[PDB]
């Protein structure tokens, strides 16, 4: 059954630290892993870099081939033992997330997986400490919270940054989006991949901003200039497979060129890429040139600029965003002299916990904004929907436009990740940010004769400048964040809509643990995407402050029937998540272009003046409570 | 016997870290280090820092102080419970070394002590697994040498400076002369103390060079500008104590001040010595000066530039 | 200002206990005072007893025939110095709730004040042994949770019983409604508070029942036999302000006589209310007869059992319900030769936590009933409210119709009600049940051509009996609680109500702290019920079970133009918690007997024969999460 099919995946994922040595008397027994695994775990698995990158697709794509899935758990058993743990796991869950015959499957926590990636080195040791310093069944509790002399106001933002949910995304969302992809090979493709990669970045960024704003903190500086030194940062985690541990770095370094990759290699493709930008097309491989056109444009600059296998020339362009990662993990030894391991940036686990991370995405975002400065800006035509007016917006918690948000207790359950010896569970007690629970009313007047449908849109963004109050539309979009999108139905005549938080197509309603996946629901059962992808829920709005910091709500419908696509998929599968995430297996169920109507540039002097009848903006105040 | 009273000491030190938990509820109750209880038990000892060297001393007179053997032991045995634990090694060393009661106690070697710092943090977690990996009673071998590309010839002299003989020894130097000794506390003194630190430093020095030179390196250039940037080294040891490691250096980073010190206080502090050599007298606290004699000058000048409690100024 | 005399206010409530030590050279001055002062500090002051309450009443009068507001503080500032603590916290807010000098002001915690009665000795002594300990001005924070092998069943009730919420309303409650309450001296009288007394008291049981059913234990059963000995109870609380502490019980004990009162007249008492119930006449002092009438009854039933001053004849009906806390109280030493504390049911802040006000309340409850089984039955034309239908509802939360219950962890500060000493603060980590928030969506059907009224009653029932699935409504009567009670306006044609949890009736939507009414906020200015009173919100709903235990989800929709009373009050004050409250100084707000329709026989086997159309059952599932 499905269940029994749950119980082998779990296995394949437990102790992926312990099951490497040989284990094979004859060691070409798996002669499809004696190339593959070429790398031995001295140095950490690189999800950016393109040699770490080709071997994690060669496995996937050996575990795409297994015939069926008892042959794919055959694989997934002898092949782990040769091939470096990390890139085993993020081979397996490309498989597990893809592959039919996983139409039964959960994967494994990845922070329960490796949870020395999510909690500090400390609370580790003292949970490792505890077990072996008295043995006894009992349980034993950690509280990961510390106590420090915290001189960096950007320890502000860990809440946000070291949060585990949102670390647990990035990792889960690369995962479906892979960047080795070949559509020919799995025959499918990924819808609008490229897009997407911009898309999803981009929110990280600008939710990132909220945070700062919310903190008084100025918005975040892209990485413009290369010759500028980094700020530093200290991870404090540590690696449980062996001796080492993130590589810190310490504050003002200048840039480094690695044997891989020279740093002006990079400028070059920098050059390039906002080049063809300007020029309105790019070269391919063959020499010819493709369109930046309207529709096809941000996708293919995502496949160029991430860069996938996908990218129209590789060669030519290379992979500008992946390099960035890589450079900036290694800075500490770009020789590879000392022979130490990289930092958090070279993990898509952990780069969100490094300041760092935002100030390169800005720099990326910057080239996709680029080329959509090339574009027109949106008439009152594409924008409005005729017939429909939006009369207000009220949006209902404790108080009504308030949303309070407070900070939770949350722990961890270290046990499936670290041997565990006797004790029964470890788990570690970790803080996080939360709101309470809220719900939208939007009144609309429906003017046609008969019932339309619309897909509301709903999205935050701060009031206030790093200045003073000025709700200036064309920065605004750097700012906006998407709440969520829906469809609904309105009849002729005063409707209103009610939806509630939890609903938010942006957040993923529930990950579900090893224990509760050792038991077996049905959300549906779906893959990698299950619990795991979606944005985490406490996270949807911004900590805003004590105060109350003030928020525009923006609500926007626009002509369903223009937004959705016509084609034939699937039963309800995991669809809750769709605004980040995409749906599995299918098209991406909206027309209008990823951050719309926020993406073109706005001329208006005020976001007001810019507003249609079918938009609306409500001001609410986000209050924290200490 | 005193071979009984080294099995009495020696499981004292062992395992430092977990015989912390203070486990008195009045913090009062130790009046007797009332005057300290500064740094945490955690936190990293500092062998060079003069605060950390205070309380050292601190301790260590309390330990001097004890009247007798046994109440020596009781006092560190209580007092290693509350202090950090490195400092409290450092005090009970130089306890043992001198304290009359203390002869034929060995002290427990430094590298069986704190075995993370002689080996790297890969040995020290492969072993630490291998005991959790499969629990037997049988015995785990691990071998230190590694595998790996060895990109700097520095590594070379890594037989040299990563030796675990002369770790060791530069330790227990240090414990026979503290920089901390105060002669009038202990009533005797440390003959001609100024003037060793200067001649082991120097051999240690001399005996690198001579090193380089086998190698077929050129003789180590000294750090005379502050303003140049240092090479980076990792070092690859990890304090199971805590998770904490020592934090590795990159190169190519010019020296920045320290809330305790600044770099300029530094230059000052060399300009200082300089003159005093030059004009061949140094002045005292008092104003007076005291001459830098062919017999005295090196050990005067030792002190000084440690320094040691001894420096004339 | 206001603000200013919050801060009067809160030092009235400041270091009670020491505020002993009279300081007075003579309280022949203080003539106003000649009447208080008999009992003596340290002495435990009884809620319940009435020699108690007069000297409690004499003092409040005093508090309250002040003159202007410098004279209330001035007078009990200088009672407080003689008056027994217990006395003086009781009088004082009565004082604050009613006495309209006081539009100003929330009374200080009782949590806060006396932490004590909230948290567990152990837990105190820590913190307090933590002060001590080392002196520092760093924080202490205690949790109180502790461990133990738990061999008592009844155990697993705690969540309910010692949570620190119900505790504090119930002390709140009294408040309101005093026993001693005189219509005359204050010239105003509470409204209908007998039948108030005994629909609170009702709703705690049937509440607690809900509590037992989700934890498998079977209904309690009334204190029906006086011979009958109690089950033990050990409350484990100190009253710091003494060495003492509430004593326990050990099971096996039978009621003894006390000085004050023989248990015989007890039994008595008890006799001759029922025996005047039957009789369907009770006899005034005056040797009238007054009918116990329809409208009227319970409320008549209601003083006399409780008693209260109310009460047509004190001399001959006796004050059952009062003793019956006394007497329990002090079975450990009736003669009160030991000189010891009493019991847990001496105090309103204390009395929930025994398990044996269950059942002396439900015996009480069912004195009540017996007067209500003597009412006739509802007649549809009573129940229905024509042209509506109700067509469905449906409860909204992470999963439709499943609401989820979950342990939250709570801090208290102690630092207002013990000395503090050098610390900043000490709290104490306690656990306490709470559940996800949700929302209703009833739809219903207005025939009628014009837009009607309707007062929606939702209550909560379980399912299941001990025996097996069984709905049915004269058992269900119990059981049903109410989780909320507003009035809505329909059009015709079809209308679809939302409701949040969050707006619910029975609770209190916040208690301030200390702290925050350190400050000033606006919620308004009214009283002792400001943010104390109300149910407490997490405990909204039962705890269900993990299997997610079934309870039915009764909607009914009444004819609020027959339901409201007409009148002439005040703005906007404590009325969130209407459905326990009532609201200040108002009239009670609904028409209809508190606890309709449960409160008459129901002839139907089945509650859903029971149904009209204007009613209508959903069944919901609690889970709680482990």
Chains 1, 3 share one sequence.
């Not at 969302?173 to 070949?182: D, E, L, Q, R, S």
């Not at 044997?259 to 010819?288: C, F, P, T």
């Not at 996709?368 to 917006?393: A, N, R, W």
């Not at 949006?395 to 949303?403: D, L, P, Y």
Request: proline share 5%.
């Amino acid at each position: 059954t499905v269940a029994d099919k749950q119980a082998r995946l779990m296995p394949l994922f437990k102790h992926l630290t312990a099951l490497t040595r040989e284990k094979l008397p004859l060691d070409q027994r798996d002669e499809r892993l004696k190339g593959v695994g070429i790398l031995p775990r001295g140095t950490l698995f690189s999800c950016f870099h393109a040699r770490h990158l080709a071997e994690a697709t060669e496995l996937y794509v050996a575990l795409y081939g297994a015939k069926d899935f008892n042959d794919f758990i055959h694989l997934c058993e002898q092949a782990r033992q040769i091939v470096n743990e990390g890139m085993f796991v993020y081979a397996v869950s490309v498989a597990v997330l893809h592959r039919e015959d996983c139409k039964g499957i959960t994967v494994p926590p990845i922070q329960e997986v490796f949870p020395d990636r999510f909690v500090p080195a400390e609370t580790i040791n003292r949970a490792n400490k505890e077990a072996s310093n008295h043995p006894d069944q009992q349980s034993i509790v950690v509280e990961a919270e510390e106590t420090g002399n915290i001189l960096d106001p950007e320890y502000k933002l860990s809440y946000f940054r070291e949060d585990i949910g949102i670390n647990a995304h990035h990792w889960h969302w690369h995962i479906v989006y892979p960047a080795t992809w070949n559509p020919t090979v799995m025959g499918k493709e990924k819808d609008r991949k490229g897009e997407l990669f911009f898309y999803m970045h981009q929110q990280m960024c600008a939710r990132y901003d909220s945070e700062r704003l919310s903190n008084g903190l100025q918005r975040m500086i892209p990485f413009h200039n290369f010759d500028e030194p980094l700020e530093g940062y200290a991870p404090h985690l540590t690696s449980l497979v062996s001796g080492l541990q993130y590589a810190s770095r310490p504050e003002g370094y200048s840039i480094h060129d690695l044997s891989d990759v020279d740093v002006q290699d990079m400028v070059r493709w920098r050059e390039r890429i906002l080049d063809a930008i300007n020029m309105h097309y790019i070269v391919d491989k063959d020499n010819n040139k493709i369109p930046l056109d309207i529709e096809h444009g941000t996708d293919i600059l995502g496949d160029i600029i991430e860069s996938s296998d996908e990218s129209k020339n590789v060669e030519y362009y290379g992979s500008l965003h992946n390099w960035g990662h890589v450079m900036m993990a290694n800075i500490t030894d770009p020789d590879h002299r000392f022979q130490e391991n990289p930092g958090v940036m070279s993990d898509t686990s952990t780069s969100l916990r490094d300041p760092i991370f935002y100030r390169w995405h800005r720099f990326i975002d910057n080239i996709f904004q680029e080329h959509k400065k090339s574009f027109h800006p949106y008439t009152k035509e594409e924008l409005s929907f005729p017939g429909v007016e939006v009369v207000g917006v009220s949006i209902n918690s404790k108080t009504a436009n308030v949303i309070t948000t407070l900070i939770k207790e949350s722990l961890l359950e270290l046990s499936h990740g670290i041997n565990f010896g006797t004790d029964q569970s470890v788990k570690v007690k970790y803080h996080h940010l939360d709101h309470e629970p809220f719900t939208y009313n939007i009144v609309v007047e429906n003017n046609s004769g008969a019932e339309k449908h619309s897909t509301v849109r709903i999205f935050l963004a701060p009031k206030y400048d790093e200045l003073n109050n000025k709700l200036e539309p064309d920065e605004q979009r750097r700012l906006f964040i998407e709440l969520d999108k829906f469809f609904y139905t309105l009849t002729p005549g005063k409707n209103t809509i009610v939806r509630n938080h939890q609903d938010s197509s942006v957040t993923i309603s529930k990950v579900r643990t090893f224990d509760q996946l050792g038991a077996g629901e049905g959300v549906s059962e779906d893959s990698t995407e299950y619990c795991s992808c979606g944005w985490p829920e406490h996270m949807l709005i911004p900590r805003g402050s004590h105060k109350g910091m003030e928020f525009e709500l923006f609500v926007m419908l626009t002509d369903h029937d223009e937004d959705t696509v016509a084609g034939l998929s699937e039963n309800a599968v995991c669809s809750d998540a769709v605004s980040y995430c995409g749906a599995r297996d299918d098209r991406y169920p909206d027309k209008k272009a990823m951050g719309f109507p926020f993406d073109r540039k706005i001329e208006a002097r005020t976001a007001a003046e810019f507003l249609t009848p079918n938009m609306g903006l409500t001001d609410i105040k986000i209050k924290f409570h200490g």
